[PDB]
Structure 1
Amino acid sequence: KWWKEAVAYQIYPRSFMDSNGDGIGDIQGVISKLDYLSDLGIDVIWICPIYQSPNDDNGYDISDYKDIMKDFGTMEDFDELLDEVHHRGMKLIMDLVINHTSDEHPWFLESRSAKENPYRDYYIWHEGKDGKEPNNWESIFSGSAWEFDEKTKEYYMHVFSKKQPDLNWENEKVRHELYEMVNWWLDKGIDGFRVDAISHIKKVAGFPDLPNPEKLDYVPSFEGHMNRPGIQEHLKELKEKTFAKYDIMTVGQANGVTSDSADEWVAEDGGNFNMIFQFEHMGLWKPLDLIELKTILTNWQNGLEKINGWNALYLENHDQIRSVNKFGSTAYRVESAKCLAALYFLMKGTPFIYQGQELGMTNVKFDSIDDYDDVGMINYYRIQREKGDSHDEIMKVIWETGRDNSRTPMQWNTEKNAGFSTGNPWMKVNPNYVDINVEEQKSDKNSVLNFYKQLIKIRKQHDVLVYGTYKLLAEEDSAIYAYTRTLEGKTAVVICNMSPNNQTFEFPSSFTNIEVLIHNYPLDKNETLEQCTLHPYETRVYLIS
């Protein structure tokens, strides 16, 4: 329940704060900005992976689960971070990455060392077929999901990069070692986990070929490994052996789960996590189809209420483009950022803020493929260019869909590198840091930052915004997303003009008292309650008694 009332903040540590001038974010950098997060009103910090890693996938390829990434600092730095976070009245959850390890993990170095060795079946090995890979599966990062090992003459599976071999969850020995490691972290007193790629741990037995109607080189392979039957056996055991033993929060990153099939994932009784990140609203690739967005988020609001589950609320993370670009408007950047904030943050659930979201940071456009880092898009570029795609065609995909958009340095001020670093940043800063930064926004009472500050405050001050029941209003309005939160004798009315235009809207009224809790436009003198005249991306929240 503390995790129900919590507001969470996600840190991408490589890009949060550099404290020693090598252009790479680090743990002492995070410590140095804890005031910012405490003052914002954050309850829980989720930090992206900080473990020993070759960084083929920036921390998600782990070579030692119990050692800190050299770029980021030492275990002593981590211990200091956790101690400072806890003394500041905040909690910290770690990123648990146990679908796969680095290919430089000791387990894998042993596993690949000989066809027969005790660690061989810690990973997923198969001999080729017809002088090719064991099957036609594509990696999520493009190319084959199998990599050949010359020494042992067999392929190993990798859903993600070539340097992220999948762990074999059918091996009891693997599972036991993973559980020990998880509990080792929980014994230090961290407050839980965000659980990475967790819907991918069950593979269809025998790894059969997938249908290939378009005759591709490799077939997108989600139907072979994403949320496959049999996965719950593993996740139930994971919960029993680790999470259930501690008072923590878990949020699983669970692609391939829909609102009608979320029962085993998040139900109050028997669910294997407290909440999950679901992906259904994050794949609407214009004028945004607002009503489709209403349908999806409402499905999840209603769906989880029915089974006493809990939603994880979010519009941004390190895997997505910026939400002003995705869901709002660069033509109305500050207004749409606040509209989007009120929209997603005040539904029933635990809201997450991704670093820079609270500033209205936006997508970047670098001209050189060398300026980017994302292993997924670097692979895409190589593969598609060979196929004939032009540089422009490919950069359009990277600019418009690439997750590097969310990994540019956090924009603290207008000093060199937006104050992220004294050196040369691992990833270039967005030039718009001269306009978009924490320092500027702290001083402006109508900043995006201070709007998030207010959102956090009203949610904490009014129980209806935490536990109140959601109901969608005005479903058929293609511009206005409106909904209520109802708890006993209090009703909150959230009104979001999700369009770049002025709109009229009839107040969806029966109250003894009405109060405006938040608004991103000045209130108009002569405007009547009944007849809303909303500016582009105007949002208002009313509290009704």
Structure 2
Amino acid sequence: KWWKEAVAYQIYPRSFMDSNGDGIGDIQGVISKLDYLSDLGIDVIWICPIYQSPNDDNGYDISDYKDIMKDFGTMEDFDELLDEVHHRGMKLIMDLVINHTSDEHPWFLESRSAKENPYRDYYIWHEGKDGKEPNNWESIFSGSAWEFDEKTKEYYMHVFSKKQPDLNWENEKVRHELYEMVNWWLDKGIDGFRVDAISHIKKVAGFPDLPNPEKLDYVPSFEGHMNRPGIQEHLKELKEKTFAKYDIMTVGQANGVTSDSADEWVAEDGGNFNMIFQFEHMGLWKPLDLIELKTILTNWQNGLEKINGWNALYLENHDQIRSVNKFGSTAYRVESAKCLAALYFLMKGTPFIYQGQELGMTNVKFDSIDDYDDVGMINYYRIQREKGDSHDEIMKVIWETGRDNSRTPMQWNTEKNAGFSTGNPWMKVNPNYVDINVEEQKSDKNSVLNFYKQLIKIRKQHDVLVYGTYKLLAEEDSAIYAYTRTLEGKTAVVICNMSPNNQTFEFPSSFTNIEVLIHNYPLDKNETLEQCTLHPYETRVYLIS
């Protein structure tokens, strides 16, 4: 229940704060900015992976689960971080990455060393078919999901990068070692986990070929490994052997789960996580189809209410483009950032803020493929270039859909590199840091940052915004997203003009008192309550007694 009332902040440590001038974020960097997060009102910090890693996938390829990434510091730095976080009245959850390891993990080095060895079946090996790969599956990062090993003359599976071989969850020995490792971390007093790629751990037995109607070189392979029947057996054991033994929060990153199939994932009774990151609102690729967004988020509000589940609320993370671009408007950057904030943050659930979201940071446009880092898009670039796509065509996809958009340095001030580093950043800063930065926003009472500060405050001060029942209003309005939160004798009315235009809206009325809790435009003297005249991306929250 503390996790129900919490607001969480997600840190991408490579790009949060560089404390020693090599252009790479680090743990002492995070420590140096804990004042910022405490003052924001954050309750829980989720930090992306900080473990030993070759960084083929920036931390999500782990070669030692019990050692800190050299770039980021030492275990002593981590211990200091956890101690400082805890003394500041915050909690910290770690990123648990156990679908796959680095190919430089000692388990895999042994596993690949000989066709027969005690670690061979820790991973997923198969001989080829017809002088090619074992099947036609595509990696999520493009190319084959199988990599040939010359020494042992077999392929190993990698859903993600070539340097991320999948662990074999059908091997009890593997599961036992993972559970020991998880509990080792929990014994240090961390407060839980965000659980990476967790819907991918069950593969269809025998890894059969997928249908290939369009005759591709490789077939997108989600139907072979995403949320496959049999997965719940593993996740139930994971919970029983680890999570259930501690008072922690868990949020599972669970692609392929829908609002009607979330029962075994988050139900109060028997659910394997406290909440999940669901993907249904993150694949709406013009004018945003607002009513489709209403349908999806409302499905999840109503769906989880029915099974006493709990939503994880979010619009941004290290895998997505920036939300002003995705859901708002660059023509109304500040206003749409605040509108989006009220919209997602005040539904029923635990809200997550991704670093820079609270500033209204936006997408970046680098001209050179050398300026990007994301293994996914770098692969995409090579493959599509060879197939004949022009540089421009490809960069368009990268600019408009690439997750590197969310990985540019956190924008602290207007000094060199926006104060992220004294050195040359591993990823270039967005040039708009001259306009968009923490220092500027602290002093402006109408900044995006101070709007988030207010959202956190009113959610904390009014129980109806935590435990109140959600109901969608004005479903057919293609511009206005409005909804209520109701708890006993209190009703909050959240009104969001999700359009770049002025709009009229009838107040969806029976109250003894009304109060405006938050608003991103100045209130108009002569405006009547009943006839809202809302400015582009205007949001208001009313509290009704």
Note the alpha carbon deviations across 1:352-374, whole angstroms, 9 max, x for none.
00000000000000000000000
Q: Shift of the alpha carbon at 1:343?
A: 0.0
Q: Shift of the alpha carbon at 1:488?
A: 0.1
Query: For the residues of structure 2 that align with 1:250 and 1:355, how far apart are their CA atoms?
Result: 20
Q: Shift of the alpha carbon at 1:40?
A: 0.0
Query: For the residues of structure 2 that align with 1:484 and 1:124, how far apart are their CA atoms?
Result: 49
Q: Shift of the alpha carbon at 1:28?
A: 0.1
Query: For the residues of structure 1 that align with 2:281 and 2:516, how far apart are their CA atoms?
Result: 28
Note the alpha carbon deviations across 1:386-431, whole angstroms, 9 max, x for none.
0000000000000000000000000000000000000000000000
SS of the residue 1:460 aligns to: helix
Q: Shift of the alpha carbon at 1:347?
A: 0.0
SS of the residue 2:442 aligns to: helix
Q: Shift of the alpha carbon at 1:497?
A: 0.0
Query: For the residues of structure 2 that align with 1:67 and 1:443, how far apart are their CA atoms?
Result: 40
Note the alpha carbon deviations across 1:426-466, whole angstroms, 9 max, x for none.
00000000000000000000000000000000000000000
Q: Does 1:269 align with 2:261?
A: no
Query: For the residues of structure 1 that align with 2:315 and 2:139, how far apart are their CA atoms?
Result: 25
Q: Shift of the alpha carbon at 1:34?
A: 0.1
Any runs of at least 4 consecutive aligned residues in structure 1 with deviations exceeding 4 A, and if so which? none
Q: State the TM-score, normalized to the length of structure 1.
A: 1.00
SS of the residue 1:518 aligns to: strand
SS of the residue 1:282 aligns to: coil
Note the alpha carbon deviations across 1:4-61, whole angstroms, 9 max, x for none.
0000000000000000000000000000000000000000000000000000000000
Q: Shift of the alpha carbon at 1:162?
A: 0.0
Query: For the residues of structure 2 that align with 1:515 and 1:526, how far apart are their CA atoms?
Result: 17
Q: Shift of the alpha carbon at 1:102?
A: 0.1
SS of the residue 1:276 aligns to: strand
Q: Shift of the alpha carbon at 1:512?
A: 0.1
Query: For the residues of structure 2 that align with 1:281 and 1:476, how far apart are their CA atoms?
Result: 18
SS of the residue 2:281 aligns to: helix
Q: Shift of the alpha carbon at 1:260?
A: 0.1
Q: Shift of the alpha carbon at 1:103?
A: 0.1
Instruction: Specify the alignment match of 2:301 in structure 1.
Output: 301
Query: For the residues of structure 2 that align with 1:423 and 1:339, how far apart are their CA atoms?
Result: 35
SS of the residue 1:60 aligns to: coil
SS of the residue 2:193 aligns to: strand
Query: For the residues of structure 2 that align with 1:510 and 1:163, how far apart are their CA atoms?
Result: 61
Aligned residues: 545
Query: For the residues of structure 1 that align with 2:95 and 2:502, how far apart are their CA atoms?
Result: 42
Query: For the residues of structure 1 that align with 2:15 and 2:8, how far apart are their CA atoms?
Result: 18
SS of the residue 1:281 aligns to: coil
SS of the residue 2:57 aligns to: coil
Q: Shift of the alpha carbon at 1:79?
A: 0.1
Q: Shift of the alpha carbon at 1:198?
A: 0.1
Query: For the residues of structure 1 that align with 2:283 and 2:369, how far apart are their CA atoms?
Result: 24
Q: CA RMSD in A?
A: 0.1
Query: For the residues of structure 2 that align with 1:530 and 1:510, how far apart are their CA atoms?
Result: 13
Q: Shift of the alpha carbon at 1:229?
A: 0.1
Note the alpha carbon deviations across 1:131-188, whole angstroms, 9 max, x for none.
0000000000000000000000000000000000000000000000000000000000
Q: List alignment gaps of at least 5 residues for structure 1.
A: none
Note the alpha carbon deviations across 1:91-120, whole angstroms, 9 max, x for none.
000000000000000000000000000000
Query: For the residues of structure 2 that align with 1:119 and 1:331, how far apart are their CA atoms?
Result: 55
Query: For the residues of structure 1 that align with 2:427 and 2:342, how far apart are their CA atoms?
Result: 30
Note the alpha carbon deviations across 1:455-513, whole angstroms, 9 max, x for none.
00000000000000000000000000000000000000000000000000000000000
Query: For the residues of structure 2 that align with 1:70 and 1:374, how far apart are their CA atoms?
Result: 20
SS of the residue 1:338 aligns to: helix
Q: Shift of the alpha carbon at 1:242?
A: 0.0
Q: Shift of the alpha carbon at 1:306?
A: 0.1
Q: Shift of the alpha carbon at 1:80?
A: 0.1
Instruction: Specify the alignment match of 2:436 in structure 1.
Output: 436
Q: Shift of the alpha carbon at 1:238?
A: 0.1
Query: For the residues of structure 1 that align with 2:223 and 2:256, how far apart are their CA atoms?
Result: 9
Instruction: Specify the alignment match of 1:199 in structure 2.
Output: 199
Query: For the residues of structure 2 that align with 1:503 and 1:389, how far apart are their CA atoms?
Result: 41
Query: For the residues of structure 2 that align with 1:358 and 1:504, how far apart are their CA atoms?
Result: 28
Query: For the residues of structure 2 that align with 1:196 and 1:449, how far apart are their CA atoms?
Result: 28
Query: For the residues of structure 1 that align with 2:76 and 2:379, how far apart are their CA atoms?
Result: 36
Q: Shift of the alpha carbon at 1:259?
A: 0.1
SS of the residue 1:203 aligns to: coil
Query: For the residues of structure 2 that align with 1:501 and 1:283, how far apart are their CA atoms?
Result: 24
Q: Shift of the alpha carbon at 1:331?
A: 0.0
Query: For the residues of structure 2 that align with 1:501 and 1:162, how far apart are their CA atoms?
Result: 47
Q: Shift of the alpha carbon at 1:308?
A: 0.1
Query: For the residues of structure 2 that align with 1:286 and 1:77, how far apart are their CA atoms?
Result: 45
Q: Shift of the alpha carbon at 1:523?
A: 0.1
Q: Shift of the alpha carbon at 1:193?
A: 0.0
Q: Does 1:286 align with 2:286?
A: yes
Query: For the residues of structure 2 that align with 1:387 and 1:76, how far apart are their CA atoms?
Result: 49
Note the alpha carbon deviations across 1:199-257, whole angstroms, 9 max, x for none.
00000000000000000000000000000000000000000000000000000000000
Instruction: Specify the alignment match of 1:59 in structure 2.
Output: 59
Query: For the residues of structure 2 that align with 1:288 and 1:417, how far apart are their CA atoms?
Result: 33
